[PDB]
Every structure is written in structure tokens, then in C-alpha cells.
Symmetry: C4
Subunit: 389 residues, 4 copies
């Protein structure tokens, strides 16, 4: 192997084609499928894999009761072959904990998991399947990270982490790893007021992360990282098309510099966007209130134009179906002259929206860009909750 | 690896020997086995694998209810080690969708899946486990393909696709791929009036596909492809021995040029034939009305002689048992001086013929040619439907 | 790889040490374990594997009902990692049928399966995971073979096959394969009156098979094969210690030349012996009437001395527990200066001896020679039949 | 590969970070998970694996009834990918028996299992997946060994074994293996009065084992081995901090030379310690009476100072939860300039402490040293016993 260099531009995207879907909830109604949440995908030179935080129980198992809870000693980052559903029999345990990120640098995979009590959590950083670095909480309030893949360039893999309140100012850092070893640590700079759950991708030597402001903004923070100089900037997505949930109705003008407040009742959801001038696509839930539906909106110059709106759209999950977290990944090792945007949507089933069952879990759908104008339909979870009752 | 070249002649065949049987329905009565339909097999330099369209649920699972339906967002092309039954734990997800083909070019495998709504479907073409090409529907009516393996020669893999009505003239194209990239597109030419579900094999630089005319003919269309010139011809199987289902009684003379109409109530079923002069074998259901039984008939010069009839026969599935789709494959990488014909029969259980259960699925049997005169027995599915009730 | 040559002598054996046990019935009471019978083991340069004839259903499944029957289209030769129990998820399907043998020649594995109706069975011979030869029944009465491993020398792998009555004279042949291709066919010669289910091993250029005379003798036939000249001889085990089941009480003198009749009610069981002068060990059921218990008896010069008796013994399965078939194998690729005898015992549970359940299956235990004097205990199946009711 | 040489010093340790947790009992409530006990971990150049003694049944299976019993013909040493739970589908059977050890020498893995009746047990020593040596009982009373990993240096792997009473003087030997072959045998020397279940690790050419005196002492025996000279010494852990269970209250002074008696009602439990001057850490159950809770105590110079006490502590399992055996392992192939201490805790569920179920099993948690001061929480089993009733 050799270190991945982000030498290629982002592919042009006109629509989104289906990459994978695991149908985990449908299958797990009668097969041994682990309860999960916070899934993502990440690729390496050999192929792409699915990742998620296991809850340490199967879906039909009695221990699925109570899995709405986010943090327990029974969670772990698991990965598995793309397209299969996650079972106790087919998963690789990457690390133990309740918040994670992972990325392959071209040579080996780095995986990071936070675990422990709220006031004293710690991250363990793995590289090539072995633990190499440990990081104690710096602010004593749920040290946590991206919940989707990091990105590497010339051996350097930046990771965004937060420690502190979910509903007030917190302490976010960008940590630059090489072979899982810390090369540099930066405090968050820029205008983003609060950072959670960054979704990141790279092209032409730049890494861009689109995150979640859980404190104030319905517009999403955008962090731009130079992995060579190991420096960064942050701001908000300029477009009037707001993409967090909950959010108010889209205003006539967005704000690049400051959070746009409003929306009820959810303070936020992990999301993503691909920002490449005219070639810009924003994902968001269809509902402005709740994690239901999912749409992709092509919003030219969303990163700079406060009045930018959609010129095209594709429904990924219809608004009669539950969505959840969404994030970015790219197969940086594809046989293509450009890096092609991909994303996943977490399809959450169970609590709190479906409280007639005792559990919370999800399935996954993932799509990638196409230059063609492809037709579309809804890739919802597909399970009947009544079958679980 | 190196590109497969179709340099060898077809083996002479006097009878058929058992290659594989997965007993999926028997096993799936009490193990975690995926609901499938439209199975096939395809080989590569390392061995042969089974393929099918999953329905995204296990057989005993509650979501098996309703799996008579052909198209949903929960289907995917899966492959698995030949002889095992397909489980959530042992399958490779090749691509996502409800119509497929796959073939290995000697170096890597190309897999193609169509998905989406009837009026706006699209194909995604994968090569070496990564998506490389997308193709939008050209006629807005269920873009679809072979449901068995394609065949490659010097890196070129032709695939037959149809878009348009199932019960009227449609728009069929032959698309010539190399490394999953389109080299050439031809509109269907020749005398075949309608083309569905082509079953293809190759020898001495020729690829021959035997298909399903769902509009008019009980005789099967035959497409002959030159993968070097990337051109083709089409006609109907000449023999009076009619091989689609449903079909009328065999007439005194077949028709090479035009469909022979008649038969009730099914408009067609995927099938196959090996056409090599005197060395010609036609498969068909034993019933002329329904997908029950399966027989192989050696019909010398079936491709040219309108009065050709069987000189030998072998019952593969007796007429007291359900069959289904059938198709061709060859282990082009066998240590033999000739390419030996193989075929599979899909053994459909459940709806609509067995409507006392809520599901539809299948198991697989596969056989290959022998120069010996081997005895035979029925390789029916073997499950007791009462056990599922 | 390179062809195995049988250059080494047989190891001296004073007692037997535990090699593997799969506990398949215990585990299969509540896991997805295939119904099997006629198991064995066979090794290759990488390690050893377990083999058996699947019945194409799990043990707890409803289709286990009726698995006392020996021949169906739902059986297959399966292999799996030594020590695991056989599940739909972990087995390799070697070939399809209801009688088998398999052996590795140092380069690739040859596996053979007979299938079909009683009057028209056929063998398919596989090599390196691909079918290479087919053999039709020569006597029209259940063409069948060893049910344990064959043995190879310089690329030549002899296999003993029988076609004809189980209760009268039949037609047995020795077929000499190389890369699964027939090099020579011999009719059975010698004094053995009937041959079934040969258990074979090799050393110093000789292959010796100890078989089952189902027609007359309670003493076992012994076939000695020269795999270089491709010739053989046959006789009966000389010792007065009779080792088939059923058998009469051991007489004062055995018979090398002719069957010793008597015993009730079973006509025979597959068994084995290692015959190496003073270093000779005979296995047999403890009961003279039924397949219960298993004992190893060191009987010096059993192959020549009609008055030879045991000088030592080791109980493998106590006589309060069911046994079944037994056979020989050797890890010819071990890092040892001699080839060490190994054997397995099939531990049959269910019908006909335990007819309070509807099924018949087995588990496996396997042991190998030790020069030490090791203590012993009973390695019985260990399942409680009441748990299955 | 090349032989591991213990050239590196032990890493400095200030706290313990989470390495792995399998949540086997939680998962096994509704998945096919084997009943086990006596688990451990052991690494090789490729990674680390979990090991345990299977009971030859799944947890939910009816045969789990009675698994409190330690010795049966249905037990085996199994290994599996670190972090997964042990299932019939994912385990490697290392050897057959009811007491074990295993270690990798840098080239291949040696695994040893004892089996048989109490008065006539025997060990079989495997190397590279093949049996190579057998050892008969020397004292006729449950020949047995470490129940955690051995350690290798320049191809030499010492193993501590005991044969004789559990409640009186027994016969312990140190056996020095190379490629599974005995190089030397020593009778136990030193002041340790009784030796069971040694937990061993190596650094700078020394192997140190911390064991269980089941006869007299609540202080643990310490055996120090020179694997080059193949010699050893033994004594007791000097510290007043007593680490066996049961034990009396810690006295004002420990004893290096002799057992400190007292404690009720358990005669002992397998445990461990890392002894490296000021860098010394003792594990023990939190309860002095029973196998509940688990704490790590940094006790500088525990190996020499009879008045040494804890300067820091970390709770691994809180005292409201069951623990069990604990032992040492190190990833000797990590990319680190020092060998980093790791340990596991067996989390026993079921009998005898939870006798409202019929079974006994466990799950695993494993942690490794960190130079950081990391926060901590309890990594208890996490299953609800009520769900099993
Ligand atoms: C075969 O498949 C083809 C590809 O899938 C498909 O091609 C599609 O064709 C349609 C019709 O030509 C195109 O639709 C066009 O979309 C743009 C963008 O619309 C999006 O944004 C607008 C503006 O939203 C903002 O303003 C409104 C208030 O005005 C606010 O509510 C909103 O919050 C924003 O602030 C929005 O109004 C649109 O809303 C539609 O879609 C959403 C889901 O995203 C629905 O929830 C909603 O009910 C409504 O239906 C939308 O979000 C628009 O400006 C044009 O007028 C036109 O509608 C697609 O872009 C195009 N897709 C692609 C990828 O090419 C073919 O239609 C298909 N063929 C057939 C026969 O089905
Ligand atoms: C050991 O195994 C050997 C190999 O399996 C086996 O060898 C077989 O031996 C038999 C007997 O010699 C041979 O049978 C011969 O078959 C030919 C061809 O028959 C097939 O086609 C005819 C004609 O069909 C057309 O015309 C009729 C009206 O006339 C229409 O109905 C039909 O639709 C067509 O238009 C057909 O009549 C035959 O029908 C038989 O078989 C079908 C199943 O395919 C049944 O459904 C039907 O009821 C009937 O039984 C058949 O389709 C025929 O012309 C000869 O007269 C002769 O019957 C096999 O070819 C031969 N097989 C091989 C591969 O060698 C041995 O028999 C076996 N030994 C034992 C003891 O079992
Ligand atoms: C620690 O483990 C050690 C190894 O496991 C173990 O060592 C064993 O020690 C015993 C006692 O010294 C030895 O036993 C000896 O065995 C020989 C051979 O006996 C076998 O054959 C005779 C003869 O059988 C023939 O004749 C009789 C009529 O006379 C017929 O019934 C029969 O069908 C034959 O024609 C037979 O009588 C023996 O029968 C015994 O064993 C069978 C099971 O095989 C039982 O079913 C039966 O009830 C009876 O118990 C036997 O088959 C014998 O001649 C000697 O007299 C002596 O009995 C073992 O050989 C030896 N094993 C090895 C491998 O070294 C230690 O005993 C053990 N220590 C402890 C404390 O347990
Ligand atoms: C973020 O995480 C940090 C790391 O996890 C954590 O750092 C910890 O901080 C605490 C507080 O500063 C430190 O605690 C210190 O521990 C030492 C050692 O205490 C241990 O040993 C003593 C002595 O035991 C002996 O004597 C007593 C009688 O005196 C006997 O009972 C006993 O059997 C022995 O003979 C013992 O008293 C302590 O007991 C405590 O802990 C045990 C569990 O181990 C409990 O069961 C018991 O109830 C009691 O709570 C203990 O065993 C001590 O001398 C100091 O006084 C001080 O208590 C930790 O060492 C330190 N850990 C590390 C690894 O750095 C932070 O606290 C955390 N931050 C927050 C906000 O949570
Ligand atoms: C799913 O998990 C929930 C949460 O643990 C279970 O509900 C809980 O059940 C327990 C046992 O009945 C209740 O405990 C009782 O609490 C009262 C006081 O609140 C106490 O007086 C009793 O002695 C007992 O401890 C508990 O309250 C209850 N919690 C809630 C939120 O309802 C539930 O049973 C689980 N469901 C299934 C199907 O497993
Ligand atoms: C297998 O799937 C079928 C099809 O979904 C299930 O049958 C359906 O069951 C639902 C719920 O009872 C029926 O819904 C009802 O429809 C009527 C109007 O038609 C409406 O008034 C009610 O409010 C309700 O929506 C539905 O009609 C029915 N469909 C059919 C074709 O019968 C069936 O229950 C499933 N079986 C099992 C065992 O899971
Ligand atoms: C296990 O398999 C056996 C053998 O198939 C099953 O027993 C069979 O059950 C069927 C259905 O009740 C019986 O069929 C009946 O036969 C009589 C004439 O003999 C006929 O008049 C009826 O119309 C019907 O066909 C069959 O006799 C019976 N066979 C035997 C040997 O008892 C059994 O039910 C299966 N058990 C389980 C639990 O699945
Ligand atoms: C779990 O395993 C235990 C131990 O094997 C089972 O308990 C045992 O059940 C058997 C059958 O009822 C009892 O056998 C009876 O023993 C008396 C004499 O003690 C005899 O007169 C009867 O003829 C019969 O043999 C046995 O005593 C009993 N043992 C104990 C310790 O209670 C138990 O049934 C199993 N539980 C489950 C749910 O599988
Ligand atoms: Ca927000
Ligand atoms: Ca038709
Ligand atoms: Ca006999
Ligand atoms: Ca003690």
C-alpha cells in the first residue's frame, strides 16, 4: 500500500444512484441482527465497508429493550462487508465505545472510539487493528466525535472532536493523526459556534466537514481543513436552504457568519453536504421538524451565496418514512479520474418516534453521484413495525 | 488474471450430471435463509458461485409475506458459494435492484442491477466490486435484463437489455461493455419480435442467447452475437419442439422467422438452449401450461430444422413438482479442451401456485453435460409446504 | 504443492489421544446444524477437515423427519473446519449425492459422489473443486463407495467402488485416478466375497483397506493395493477377534481365506483397522449385536495370525452409548518422520435405535495414535434425547 | 515469521484503557452463542484473539443445563476473532479438553488441552494446528494448566502444569516447549506451596507468572522463569495487599516466603499481577469473600515490599456485579518500543451465584495499559438474568 493523496477533483454530480442497502430491520425481524445506530461507510483500497455503533444485543433479543439510550459499556464500533446486515457472526469489532470515527490512510485503517462515564470519557485510537494512542476528556462532558468517516492525505488524518455541553459553548479540537499518533492539536477556530458530528470528504488537497450546531443554528457549520499545513477555518453554510433538523422555514437569505435560530423541537441531527461551487448538493430531512424523509438538493454556490436555492432535487426517502443521521464518504481508491461523492442515510426505527416497541435501531441506505439524470424512488427502511409487536 | 477468450468448441453432450443443489427451502424452514427468486450461476477463474435476487427478508420471517411481488427497494443481487443456501451471513451483495446479470471477464466480475420505479428505472454497472457506469431508462417502462450470466470475450461482455411493455413491442438493446464501460450500443435487430431474460453462452468466438418472447411466440427467440465485431442477428428457434411456457402442443413444423402463438395462461418463462448442430439440447417445463416439471431434449439441428424432434431425453424435475426459470452458464475456466454446457433450474415454491403460504421463494439445482449416458432422477425442491403452515 | 508420496512407515501406537469432537447433536438442539450421517475426516497440506453426507435439512427442522432414509436428491458431501459442527453457514459442498469418498493428492482434492435412482446411479468425480469425470452404474444396483477418505501416492488415488446387491455377490472395482481422471480399472480380485465401505490408509508405498462384507462374513475383508503398479489383492482379517457388527462370539481361530458367518441381526457396519505386524490395532463396536460402544484392541499380527488376541485395549465409547460407522485417516502432511494412524467414530443418534424422535443424525469423535500410554474415557455423543422431545 | 524474542521492557502504566468486550451473555440470550468459561486472550503477529473452554452447547440450548460442572468430554479450547462473541459458526477448535493454555512463538501457535478422567488425564500439545506431543498424568489427579496464555522467547515456551490434590500438596512442573516438543522438564522449586492457573507475561528476557495457591495462601504465588537457561524460582507476592479470593482483610505486613491463610469460603480464583518495581499493578476482586467486582491497584514494589500499598486505583467491574477469573496477556507484536501490559476479566453469570438459572457461562472484558490518566467506568457483563427465566 501507499498513503492516499487527495490529488483528484470532485466528480460532477447530476443525480444519485443506489450503492448499497442492508435492509437490516426487515431481516433482523427473524435473523440474528445486532441493534445499532449511528452508521456510516468507509472504504479502503480493497473495497467499502459498513460501520455502526452496536448496542451489544440482537434486535429480537430481550436486551434490545432500552436501546434508545446512547451511552453504555455494551456499545462498540463494528464494521462489516457492504450490503450485508450486521450480525454477531459477520462483524469486525473496531474499538469499544459509544462515539466513533474511522478512515483508511491508504496503508492501514485508523479507528477511534470514545467510552466511559459522561464526566470522564476517553478516546482510544486504533491503527492497523491495534490500539496506539489514548486521549482523556479535556472538558469533562462526553468527549465525542464524528460518527462518520475521517479523511486522510499523505498519511495525515484530521479528526474533529468535541467535549463539553450539547446545549451551550463546548470545547472542540481538530486532532491531526499519522499512524494513529498525534502530530498536532488545534482548538476550533472560525465562526462556528458549536460543532457536533462532522461529515467530511476531501478533494484537491482540501478536506471539508459539514457539521451539526446543536446549540444555536439551523444552518450547518462548515469546517475547511488543510491537511498539509494542518490548519483550518470554520463558518456556516451560506445558503438560505437550511439543512439541520429541526429548522424554521427557509428564509429569503441565509447567513455565512452566524447561526440562524428557530425550529422545534429537535436541537439537531448529523448531516452533510458536498460543496464545490456550482457542483454543490445539500442533504436534509424532508420534515423541518422531525427526522422523517430525506432529500438531496442541488444548490449552486451554497457555500458563498446567501440567496442560493435548489435547481434540482432528488427524494431519497419519502416523507412518510423515518430517516435519521446522514453523512459523507468517498471511495478514494476507485478507478476514476475524479473522487465521486457518496452519502448514506440512517433509517431509524423504534423509539422515540415508534414507541410501541421497546428498542431503537436502524438500517442503512447509501448512494453515490452520477453524471446521468437518473430516475429515483424512495429507499425507506421497509420493515413493518407491527411484525415486531 | 487475463481476459477470457472464447477459443474452445462446445463439449459434446449425451446426458446431464448433477453439479449442485442448495435445498434452500428445506433448510430455510428452520435456518436463516433469504427469500430469493430469479437465481443463476456464474463462474470465475477460482470457481463457480450461485446468484439470485434477494427479497431482503428471511423465508420464515414475517416480511416474507408479499414476496410474490417482483420489484421493491428491498431487493438486491446476491452471490454465494456454490451449493450453500443463501443466508444473511454468507452472501455477497453484488448490486442493488430487481433485475440483474453478471459475468467475469477473466480478470474481474461485472455485475449489473436495475432499480427504481417502473417509469424511471436505471441500471448500475459494477466492475471489480465498484460501480463504474449508470444507464437511465430509455423507454420509461421497467428497464430490465437477463436474470442469468452474461459472457465475455477478449474483455468485451455483451448484455441484452429491454425497456418497454411486457405485452407489446418494446425497445431492446445490446450493450457491449469492457471493464463495465460502454464500448458500443446496438438496437435489437433481426426477426425476434420481443426479447426478455436472455440465457447466453459462448464458444469459438460466438455468443448465443436464447430468450423469452413475452408478447407473441411460444418458440424462443435466439440472438447470435459476435463480440469482436460487436454485431448481432436474431431469429426464432426453428424446431417444432416449442420451449416457452405457456405453449400449444408442438406442431408438425416450427418457424425460424416468426412467433408461433398459442398456449394459455402464462405469457412466458425464462429458458435456454444449447445450439450446436447435432449437439443441440432444448430445456423446457414438462407442462405446456404451467411452470411444472423440467425436461432436457436432444433435438439435433434445432437451430435450422423446422421438423427437428427429440432423439433423447432426460427428466430433470418430474411433472409432479414445481420448476421455474432456467438458464445457461459455463465454467469457461475448467481444465477441459472444450467448454461444457451447464444449466440451472429455479425451483419455485409458494405463490401463486401454492397460495396456502404468504411467500414466494425458490431453491436451485444445476447440472452439466456428460459424454456418458448417465442415469437420472428428479431433482425437485424437496420441501413439504405443510411444514410451513 | 507437490504430489504426496507414501514414503514414510506407520507410527508405532500404544494408545489413542483425542484429536477432535464436534458435539454436533448437543449444539444442534438449539443452533442451525445440518442433519448428517456417514462422516469422516480427510487432511491436506494446510490441515484436516470433517466430511459427511448432509441430508439437506437442519436437525431441529421439520424436514429432519424421515432422515433414517439413506438415499434422496437432497443429500450432498459437505466438508467443514475440523472441530466445528456442520451448519448451513460453514460447510463447503464437495459434490451432490448419497455415497462418497474424498482425498487430497498433495496438490488438489478429489471428491466423488454417487447419486440417482437405485437402478441407474452415477458417480461424479471432482478435482480441485470442478467436476472432471462421470461414471455410470455398471450393475444397476446402487453404485456406491467408501464413505471415508481415499489415499494418494505419486498422483495416483485408488478408490474402491461397489455396484450390485447388498445381500449377495456384487461387482466391486478398484478405480485408479489421477487428477480425477481414470488411469486404470480393475475388477475386484482375491478372496473377499463382498466389499462395502472400505476404510483405507497408506505407508511405505502400500495402501491397505479394511472393509465390510455385508453378505457373509463377520470378519472384515482386507484389500491391499500397490498404487504404483496399480494392482491389488484381497483376503479376510485373519484374527479370531471379529470386528464387523453383528458378529458371533469370537471363535478360537479366525479365517484369512473365507467369511466367518453368524451374528444377528445387523448384516454389517463400516469399520477399520491398522495392520502393521505387531503394531496392529482393530476397532469394533463393544456390542456384538448392535452399533453400541467402541473399543480399540491391539492385536499383534492380526493380519496373519488366526489365533491372535488383544494384548491391550482402549474404550473409545462406552457400551451404554451409541456408536456407528468408523474409518481411518492420516495427516500425511504432518511434521513427523512417520505417518500416524487416526480414526473417527460416528456417533449415531435417533432412528432406528432411538425411535422416539423422527430423525437420524450423528456427531463425530476422532483420535490419533500416541506412543505414550495415555489414560482414556468415553467420548460419547453427549446429547440428551429427551431434550429433543 | 521469526521467533519472538522478549527484548523489550514493560511499558509504564498509569491507568487502563478498554481493549475489547464481547457482551456474549447479552447477545447469547437470543443468538447462537456457545456456553464457555475460563476465557483469555492471546495475540500473534496478525492480531489478538479471544480463547475459552467451550461446554459444547449454546447458552439458550437445553444442554446448557448442568454447565456448572468443570470437566466433561464435551469441552474444547476454542478461539475467535477478538470482540466477537463465541458462536458455533465463528470459532476455531484449538484442541479438545477441560484445561488449556496457548501461545504464539512468532512463527506458529502452540495450544495445549488436558482431557480424560480425573485419575488418568492427559495433555495433547498442538503446534501449527497439528498435534505433536502427548503427556500422561504423572500424579493421577486432574492434570491441568494455566487457563491463560503462555509466553515464548527465542522459540522456547514454558508452561506451568499441576497434577495432584486441589486442597493439599500437588506435583507442579514447568515444561519447556519448542515447536510443541519438550526440551526440558523441571519440578516446581521455590517457596510456593501450591500452584494453580498461572497468569504469565514476559519482558527483557524474563517470564513472570502470578498464580493461585488453592491450598493455603491468600497471597498469590509468583514464579519467575528464565526461558534461555530454562530455570525458575518461586515465592509469594510480598505486598500486604492480598489478591486471591477468598482472603482475609489486608494485614499490616504481607509475606514473601509463606502463605497467609484465612478468608472464607472460596479456596481461590485465577488472577494476575504485573510486577515491575514502581510500575507494579495488582488485580483482585473487590469482595474479599466472593468473585464480585474487580479493581486494579498500583502498588509500587509489591514484589519486594511487605508493607507496600496502593498509590492509585481503577475500578474495572463494580462490586454490584459478578467477576471471575482474570489473567495477563501482551500483544508482543505491537508497533511499540515497550511491551504493554493487558489483562482480561471473566464475567461469570449463572451458577452458583445465580442459581435461578440452570447454566454457568461468562462474557469477557479486556483492557491494556495507558501512560495517560484515563477516566473509568464499570465494564460489567450487562445481561439481565430475568430475561433468561
Ligand atoms: C425521472 O427521474 C428524474 C430524476 O429523478 C426526474 O427528474 C426530476 O424532474 C423534476 C421535474 O422536472 C425536477 O424538479 C425540479 O426541481 C427543482 C428544485 O425543486 C426543489 O426545491 C424547490 C424549492 O425549495 C425551496 O423553496 C420552497 C418554496 O418555494 C420551500 O418549500 C423549500 O423548503 C425550499 O426553500 C422545492 O419547491 C421542491 O419541492 C418539491 O420536491 C420536494 C422534495 O425535494 C417535495 O417534498 C415537494 O413537495 C416538491 O415536490 C424541491 O425540493 C424545482 O425548482 C423545479 O420547479 C422542478 O420541480 C428535478 O430536479 C429532477 N431531478 C433530477 C435529479 O434531475 C424526473 O421527474 C423523473 N421522471 C418522472 C416521469 O418521474
Ligand atoms: C438409465 O438412464 C438413462 C439416461 O437417463 C436412460 O436412458 C434413456 O432411455 C430412454 C429409453 O430408451 C430414452 O428414451 C427415448 O427418448 C426419445 C425422446 O423422447 C422424448 O421426446 C419424445 C417426443 O416428444 C415429441 O413428440 C411427442 C408426441 O409424440 C410430444 O408429446 C412431445 O411434446 C414432443 O413434441 C417424447 O414422446 C418423450 O416423452 C417421454 O418423456 C417425457 C419426458 O421428457 C415424459 O414426460 C413422457 O411421458 C414420455 O415418458 C420424450 O420427451 C424417444 O423418441 C424414444 O422413443 C425413447 O423414449 C432416453 O432418451 C434415454 N436418455 C438418455 C439421456 O440417454 C435409461 O432409460 C435408464 N435406464 C433405466 C432402466 O431407467
Ligand atoms: C490409565 O489409562 C491406561 C490406558 O487407557 C490404562 O491402561 C490399561 O490398563 C488395563 C489394565 O492393565 C489394560 O487392560 C488389559 O487389556 C488386555 C486386553 O483386554 C482386552 O481384550 C480382552 C480379551 O478379549 C477377547 O477375549 C474375551 C474373552 O476372554 C472376549 O470377551 C473378547 O470378545 C475377545 O475375544 C478382553 O477380555 C478385555 O475386555 C475388557 O475390556 C473391554 C473393552 O475393550 C470391556 O468391554 C470388558 O468388560 C473388559 O473390561 C479387553 O477388550 C487384557 O488381556 C488384560 O488382562 C488387561 O485387562 C489395558 O490394555 C491398558 N490400556 C492401554 C492402552 O494401555 C489404565 O488402566 C488406566 N489407569 C486407571 C487407574 O484407570
Ligand atoms: C477521572 O478518572 C480518573 C482515573 O480513573 C480518576 O482518577 C482517580 O482519582 C482518585 C481520587 O484522586 C484516585 O483515588 C486514590 O486512590 C488511592 C488508592 O486507593 C485504593 O487503595 C486504598 C487503600 O486500600 C487499602 O487499605 C484499605 C483501608 O485503608 C483497605 O480497605 C484495602 O483493602 C487496602 O488494604 C483504598 O482505600 C481505595 O478504596 C477505594 O476504591 C475502592 C476500589 O478500588 C473502593 O471499593 C473503595 O470503596 C474506595 O472507594 C482504593 O482501592 C487512595 O490512596 C487515594 O486516597 C485516592 O482515593 C485514583 O487513584 C485515580 N485513578 C487513577 C487511575 O488515576 C478520577 O477520580 C476521575 N474523575 C472523576 C471526577 O471521577
Ligand atoms: C423493558 O425495560 C424496562 C425498564 O427497565 C422494564 O420496566 C421496568 O420493570 C421493572 C420490573 O417490573 C420495574 O421495577 C419496579 O419498579 C418499582 C418502582 O418503580 C419497584 O417498586 C419494584 O420493586 C420494581 O423494582 C420498573 O419500574 C420498570 N420501569 C419502567 C420504566 O417501566 C420493562 O419491564 C422491560 N420490558 C420487557 C418486556 O422486558
Ligand atoms: C400479509 O400481508 C397482507 C397484505 O398487507 C396483510 O393483509 C392486510 O392486513 C391489513 C391489516 O389488517 C388490512 O388492512 C385493512 O384494510 C382495510 C381496507 O381494505 C381497512 O379498512 C383497515 O383499516 C385496514 O387498513 C388489509 O386489507 C389486508 N390486505 C389483504 C390483501 O388482505 C396480512 O395481514 C399479512 N399477513 C400476515 C400473517 O402477516
Ligand atoms: C413425519 O413424516 C411422516 C411420514 O411422512 C408423517 O406421517 C404421515 O402423515 C401423513 C399425513 O397425515 C399420513 O398421510 C395419510 O395417509 C393415509 C393413508 O395411509 C391417507 O388416507 C391420508 O389421506 C393421508 O395421506 C401418512 O400415513 C403418515 N405416514 C406414517 C408412516 O405415519 C408424519 O406426520 C411426520 N411427522 C411430523 C411431526 O411432521
Ligand atoms: C436439568 O438437569 C437436571 C439434572 O439432570 C434435571 O433434573 C433431574 O431430572 C431427572 C428426570 O426427572 C430426575 O431423575 C429422576 O431421579 C429419581 C431419583 O432421584 C428417579 O426416581 C427417577 O426415575 C428419575 O430418574 C433427577 O432426579 C433430576 N435431578 C435433579 C438434581 O433434580 C432437570 O430436569 C434438568 N432441567 C431441565 C429444565 O432440563
Ligand atoms: Ca441545530
Ligand atoms: Ca411466450
Ligand atoms: Ca458382515
Ligand atoms: Ca488461595
Amino acid at each position: 500500500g501507499t498513503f492516499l493523496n487527495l490529488t483528484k477533483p470532485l466528480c460532477e454530480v447530476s443525480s444519485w444512484h443506489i450503492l448499497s442497502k442492508d435492509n437490516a430491520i426487515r431481516i433482523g425481524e427473524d435473523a440474528h441482527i445486532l441493534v445499532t445506530r449511528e452508521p456510516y461507510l468507509s472504504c479502503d483500497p480493497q473495497g467499502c465497508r459498513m460501520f455502526a455503533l452496536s448496542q451489544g444485543t440482537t434486535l429480537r433479543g430481550r436486551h434490545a429493550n432500552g436501546t434508545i439510550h446512547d451511552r453504555s459499556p455494551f456499545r462498540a464500533l463494528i464494521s462489516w462487508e457492504m450490503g450485508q446486515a450486521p450480525s454477531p457472526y459477520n462483524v469486525r469489532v473496531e474499538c469499544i465505545g459509544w462515539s466513533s470515527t474511522s478512515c483508511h490512510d491508504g496503508i492501514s485503517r485508523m479507528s477511534i472510539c470514545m467510552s466511559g462515564p459522561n464526566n470522564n470519557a476517553s478516546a482510544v485510537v486504533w491503527y492497523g487493528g491495534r490500539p496506539v494512542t489514548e486521549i482523556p476528556s479535556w472538558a469533562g462532558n462526553i468527549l465525542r466525535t464524528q460518527e462518520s468517516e475521517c479523511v486522510c492525505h499523505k498519511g495525515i488524518c484530521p479528526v474533529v472532536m468535541t467535549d463539553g455541553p450539547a446545549n451551550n459553548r463546548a470545547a472542540t479540537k481538530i486532532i491531526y493523526f499519522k499512524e494513529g499518533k498525534i502530530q498536532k492539536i488545534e482548538e476550533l477556530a472560525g465562526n462556528a459556534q458549536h460543532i457536533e458530528e462532522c461529515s467530511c470528504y476531501g478533494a484537491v488537497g482540501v478536506i471539508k466537514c459539514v457539521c451539526r450546531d446543536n446549540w444555536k443554528g439551523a444552518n450547518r457549520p462548515v469546517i475547511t481543513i488543510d491537511p498539509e499545513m494542518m490548519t483550518h477555518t470554520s463558518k456556516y453554510l451560506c445558503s438560505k436552504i437550511l439543512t439541520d433538523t429541526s429548522r424554521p422555514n427557509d428564509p429569503t437569505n441565509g447567513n455565512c457568519d452566524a447561526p440562524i435560530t428557530g425550529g422545534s423541537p429537535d436541537p439537531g441531527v448529523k448531516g452533510f453536504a458536498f460543496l464545490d461551487g456550482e457542483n454543490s448538493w445539500l442533504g436534509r430531512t424532508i420534515s423541518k421538524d422531525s427526522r422523517s424523509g430525506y432529500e438531496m438538493l442541488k444548490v449552486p454556490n451554497a457555500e458563498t451565496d446567501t440567496q442560493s436555492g435548489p435547481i434540482s432535487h432528488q427524494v431519497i426517502v419519502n416523507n412518510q418514512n423515518w430517516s435519521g443521521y446522514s453523512g459523507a464518504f468517498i471511495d478514494y481508491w476507485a478507478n476514476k479520474e475524479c473522487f465521486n461523492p457518496c452519502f448514506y442515510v440512517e433509517l431509524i426505527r423504534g423509539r422515540p418516534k415508534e414507541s410501541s416497541v421497546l428498542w431503537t435501531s436502524n438500517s442503512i441506505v447509501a448512494l453515490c453521484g452520477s453524471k446521468e439524470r437518473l430516475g429515483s424512488w424512495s429507499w425507506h427502511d421497509g420493515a413493518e413495525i407491527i411484525y415486531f409487536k
